[PDB]
């Protein structure tokens, strides 16, 4: 059974939020 | 790169030697008068610009009359139908229209003057020149004055203006201009009335002078009555 498109896009949006948080951590490290 | 700035010391390939005036001291014994030398016989002088407008229409109508003359002499096609040859479609025909042309505008086969190609070149060349002549665009030759119909710098490489009397040459051009414009008007009216080219009308009028006139064709209604 393949993954539903909603599943893929929800995981991808969670990834986008994780990436935002990674940018926040990188900026905080750079200070 | 260093600045050389040497002396060119070049002379014109041809530079007409002084020949002066080849006309009588009287310059317009004909009907009317040149602008700036008397009062207009009939029509009111519209504006100072009208003299230069007359010169430009004159030179253009000279070139148009000679073009219709040579086109009908070399191809037999009337000038008023020569436009139908080069069209967005089948502009290949317009190529071989010059008697003795070593080569065609359209080499045999596809190779050809396209209407749009010709047109695009025509706009880009003639409009540029038209603008540069007038106040549009700018002046690429500061030594000459835009808005002057007789610049007489690079535009007389042979130097006839300075070689002779300038103003007699000017009036000579003006008379040629008015003659050719009136002849052009005659050509358009003949095209309208007889549907045949200028040299065709000439030939008909000289073969039998007594007939083949305005009034002869009027007897048939100019093919409309």
């Amino acid at each position: 059974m393949p993954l539903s498109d909603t599943q893929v896009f929800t995981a991808l949006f969670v990834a986008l939020i994780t990436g935002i948080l990674s940018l926040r951590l990188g900026t905080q490290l750079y200070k | 790169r260093r600045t050389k700035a040497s002396v060119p010391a070049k002379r014109s390939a041809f530079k007409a030697n002084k020949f002066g005036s080849l006309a009588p001291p009287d310059l317009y014994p004909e009907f009317g008068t040149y602008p700036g030398g008397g009062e207009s016989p009939v029509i009111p002088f519209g504006s100072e610009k009208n003299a230069e407008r007359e010169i430009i229409h004159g030179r253009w109508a000279m070139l148009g009359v000679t073009g219709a003359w040579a086109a009908e002499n070399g191809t037999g096609i009337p000038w008023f139908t020569a436009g139908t040859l080069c069209t967005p479609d089948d502009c290949t025909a317009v190529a071989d229209k010059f008697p003795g042309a070593v080569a065609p505008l359209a080499p045999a086969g596809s190779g050809y003057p396209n209407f749009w190609a010709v047109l695009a070149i025509e706009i880009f060349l003639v409009g540029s020149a038209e603008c540069y002549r007038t106040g549009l665009f700018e002046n690429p030759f500061p030594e000459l004055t835009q808005g002057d119909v007789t610049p007489g710098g690079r535009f007389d490489p042979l130097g006839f203006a300075e070689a002779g009397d300038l103003e007699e040459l000017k009036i000579k051009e003006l008379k040629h201009s008015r003659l050719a414009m009136f002849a052009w008007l005659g050509c358009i009216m003949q095209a309208l009335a007889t549907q045949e080219g200028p040299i065709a009308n000439w030939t008909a009028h000289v073969a039998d002078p007594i007939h083949a006139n305005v009034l002869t064709n009027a007897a048939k209604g100019f093919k409309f009555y």
């Binding site: 909603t6 896009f9 929800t10 949006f13 939020i17 926040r24 900026t27 750079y30 | -």
Partner: protein, 194 residues
């Protein structure tokens, strides 16, 4: 003035001067001073076109005319090529005039801004609702009003995506509050540097 959420901090370049300024620019697109008037005018244009589009969609739908997505295929007097040539010429001339006027250069302004903003949201909604359900805006509204509890975006094919996005929106300002009270708010970088 009220900002884009209770407790937000407006960016320093968003001081309420512009119409509709709610201090919303997380990605700092209008941070550059010289492009900010351009971005204002891009907002106003996209809003105006969305407003006109919303009117021409809703009236068309409610008057029995062909559906907005189908309206292209209808048989018109002029074919596609001549119509696009007309469009290219006239819109080029009009947009040239608009550009030169822009180069030259309260209540009603704010009104227009808000209206355009709603329109752009409403137009995006119409396109998304058609792409997901295949129902036109008035049909979609009737379907929703028929069964409001279960017929919605969050129960459609993209439902979980929308629920996750709304969760992100609901949990963003709380994290921003932590960032303010814990961090110094002294970011040297912007999400869009130019």
């Amino acid at each position: 003035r009220e900002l884009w959420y209770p407790g937000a901090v407006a960016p320093e370049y968003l001081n309420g001067s512009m119409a509709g300024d709610y201090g919303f620019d997380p990605l700092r697109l209008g941070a550059n001073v010289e492009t900010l008037p351009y971005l204002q005018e891009a907002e106003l244009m996209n809003g105006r076109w969305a407003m006109a589009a919303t009117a021409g969609i809703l009236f068309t739908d409610a008057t029995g005319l062909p559906k907005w997505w189908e309206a292209g295929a209808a048989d018109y007097g002029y074919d596609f090529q001549t119509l696009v040539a007309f469009q290219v010429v006239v819109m080029g001339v009009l947009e040239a005039f608009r550009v030169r006027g822009l180069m030259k250069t309260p209540d009603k302004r704010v009104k227009e801004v808000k209206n355009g903003r709603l329109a752009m949201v409403a137009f995006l909604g119409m396109v998304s609702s058609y792409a997901v359900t295949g129902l036109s805006p008035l049909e979609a509204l009737e379907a929703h009003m028929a069964n409001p509890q279960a017929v919605n975006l969050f129960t459609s094919a993209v439902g979980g995506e929308s629920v996750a996005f709304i969760a992100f929106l609901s949990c963003a300002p709380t994290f921003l509050l932590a960032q303010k009270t814990l961090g110094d708010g002294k970011e040297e970088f912007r999400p869009i540097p130019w």
